[PDB]
Write an enzyme that holds these catalytic residues in place. Sequence first.
Site, PDB file in Angstrom:
ATOM      1  CB  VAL A  19      -6.041  -7.790 -26.599  1.00  0.00           C
ATOM      2  CG1 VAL A  19      -6.633  -9.009 -26.246  1.00  0.00           C
ATOM      3  CG2 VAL A  19      -4.647  -7.493 -26.404  1.00  0.00           C
TER       4      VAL A  19
ATOM      5  CE1 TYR B  58       5.394   1.148 -30.411  1.00  0.00           C
ATOM      6  CE2 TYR B  58       6.456   0.100 -28.501  1.00  0.00           C
ATOM      7  CZ  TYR B  58       6.385   0.999 -29.295  1.00  0.00           C
ATOM      8  OH  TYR B  58       7.285   2.298 -29.132  1.00  0.00           O
TER       9      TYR B  58
ATOM     10  NE  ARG C  50      -4.322   1.517 -31.021  1.00  0.00           N
ATOM     11  CZ  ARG C  50      -4.834   2.071 -31.834  1.00  0.00           C
ATOM     12  NH1 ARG C  50      -5.895   2.988 -32.149  1.00  0.00           N
ATOM     13  NH2 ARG C  50      -3.811   2.247 -32.993  1.00  0.00           N
ATOM     14  N   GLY C  51      -3.039  -1.702 -26.338  1.00  0.00           N
ATOM     15  CA  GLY C  51      -1.772  -1.450 -25.860  1.00  0.00           C
ATOM     16  C   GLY C  51      -0.924  -0.790 -26.582  1.00  0.00           C
TER      17      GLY C  51
ATOM     18  CG  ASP D 202       4.515  -4.792 -18.078  1.00  0.00           C
ATOM     19  OD1 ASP D 202       4.257  -3.824 -17.428  1.00  0.00           O
ATOM     20  OD2 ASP D 202       3.760  -4.779 -19.105  1.00  0.00           O
TER      21      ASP D 202
ATOM     22  CE  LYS E  52       0.191  -8.867 -26.875  1.00  0.00           C
ATOM     23  NZ  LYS E  52       1.193  -9.172 -25.556  1.00  0.00           N
TER      24      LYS E  52
END
EC number: 2.7.11.1
Lengths: 326, 326
Positions: free
Chosen positions: B51, B48, B45-46, B154, B66
């Site tokens: 996955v 925004y 979990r990122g 990133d 995603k």
Amino acid sequence: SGPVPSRARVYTDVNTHRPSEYWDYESHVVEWGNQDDYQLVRKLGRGKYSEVFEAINITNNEKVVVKILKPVKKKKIKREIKILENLRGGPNIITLADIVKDPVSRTPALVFEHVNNTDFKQLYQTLTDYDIRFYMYEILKALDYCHSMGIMHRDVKPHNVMIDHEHRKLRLIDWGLAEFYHPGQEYNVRVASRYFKGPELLVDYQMYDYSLDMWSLGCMLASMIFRKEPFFHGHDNYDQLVRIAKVLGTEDLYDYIDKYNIELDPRFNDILGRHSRKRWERFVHSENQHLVSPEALDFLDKLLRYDHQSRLTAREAMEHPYFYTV
Amino acid sequence: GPVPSRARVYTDVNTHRPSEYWDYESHVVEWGNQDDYQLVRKLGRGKYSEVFEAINITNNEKVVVKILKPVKKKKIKREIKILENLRGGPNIITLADIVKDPVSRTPALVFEHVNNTDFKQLYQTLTDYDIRFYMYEILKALDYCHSMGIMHRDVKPHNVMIDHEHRKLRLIDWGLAEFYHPGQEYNVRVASRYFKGPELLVDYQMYDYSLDMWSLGCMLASMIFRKEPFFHGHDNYDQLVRIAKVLGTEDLYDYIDKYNIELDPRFNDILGRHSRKRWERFVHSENQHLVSPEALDFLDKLLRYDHQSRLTAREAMEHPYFYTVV
Ligand SMILES: Clc1cc(CNCCc2ncc[nH]2)ccc1-c1ccccc1
């Protein structure tokens, strides 16, 4: 019950004994490089699902050939790429240099080594009987190699043979129809270009092998020595078999289809007729006699056979007296 | 104000391309049907995005899904456009589908499945060679995306999925990626703290692809020295201090002077004075097997304050540290 099964007499299990990754083109990971490195110069031609261009690789000032593919079938693009990658560096095989995709267009493009082609018609006038032997040997190198790699070209024809006569360089190209041979597998017969189609394809016998390419090569040799382009001039796929039957005879055709228990299509009965087996010396004329020899006719006779199992393999063909001078 | 800057490589790739390629705001997004995909488990979990490992029920093949929290539509379009643009590039996560759940109408991106080897097992058994190998694989992804006019922005261990069993690497999480346009001033609130280049921390907006090269340097240093993370800031200001404790405050003032950078007053009481540390200082018994003069020479050429002075991905690929890799 159905047709009798068949398998290649050579390189039968080359794909079975290899890893899954090598023969599975559906699982192959394709890495599309940037198309910027290439500057397109001119259109060299336009095929059914491809447009070919002469290009310059700006990173090294080297000429390349760029084949922009109409991405009509993804599985088909993957198979070609995989086969080209597998065969890369093989004798007289077109060298795939890069796989690229133009960024806005997102169209697949294959980048190959550039070949300075000598025209089919132009080469034909100056082609000696030795020259036919030499180049036929060069194609045999490509075929024995791709067959040894478990691949059948399935589209052998003069258009797919690029020659630089000045440098005596030959490349077998247009792998798009090429396929991995697996013993017992039943393949689509809608392959090769009409004049070069083997009897197996025309009678819808799916369990064919590398020997298909040997029929096609026979058709090319026949057209060359005899100066009759194409040798078997069918006007459609059914008529194509009739054109072969007019030369090989209908007796051996029925022996072939009986041997493999082939169900002949109803559209054949009314066009096939009855034909005697013709001698190979009958096509010898004043315009072609200088390219014809007993060796040439003996070799051709051993390629143009209905029975795909009875045709010489590329390696046997390389050992034929016809090539004792090369 | 601040002196302008531009990338030393791929400077105008975007400029010379049509509007459709880089105007993600105008890109037309076609959301397929999510019913082809069955979710299996949560992979993480990122910020925004969530996955999931999923199965494409139409072909029984695993895929990565995603689910994106649609806080901003412009960002989603940017990611989709970039993924579509980069699709097929070497070691780039392959976008397979763009779907919306029929009832939730929540945007979801479907990618080719990557089996990620457990980081802990990989970290301990990793050797000098594995690092060289995987670093080269990331460089392939970066040189490619920078060639396409895109900076990842990133780069960090979390955005690099590695299948060790098959030696496969994918650069993922393109949600913060952006089209490079020479002279454009970008938001510095990008990358992850430990991986943020000096340009971001000093609020120098005219950065380029070289940002990704600093981030990669942070990963390399962390890998060879077994220190995670290498520069351990507790916030964005402290982050520059951690870098200054290694690179020295001398070069930091040379950098900000070169670009006429206004150093935030928050740096006044925390920056201090620091000498330039030798990279050999970070070598210990627990990591000496992964360190070499080549590794230290390469790292030294990545971890530079001056973004223009850092090796580009292509120059980095030609470094002696990679002489042992294919
Ligand atoms: Cl970047 C990285 C990343 C990983 C694992 N990344 C986990 C990514 C992930 N986990 C869950 C979702 N994504 C392992 C090794 C590396 C690595 C290998 C060589 C040199 C430097 C770094």
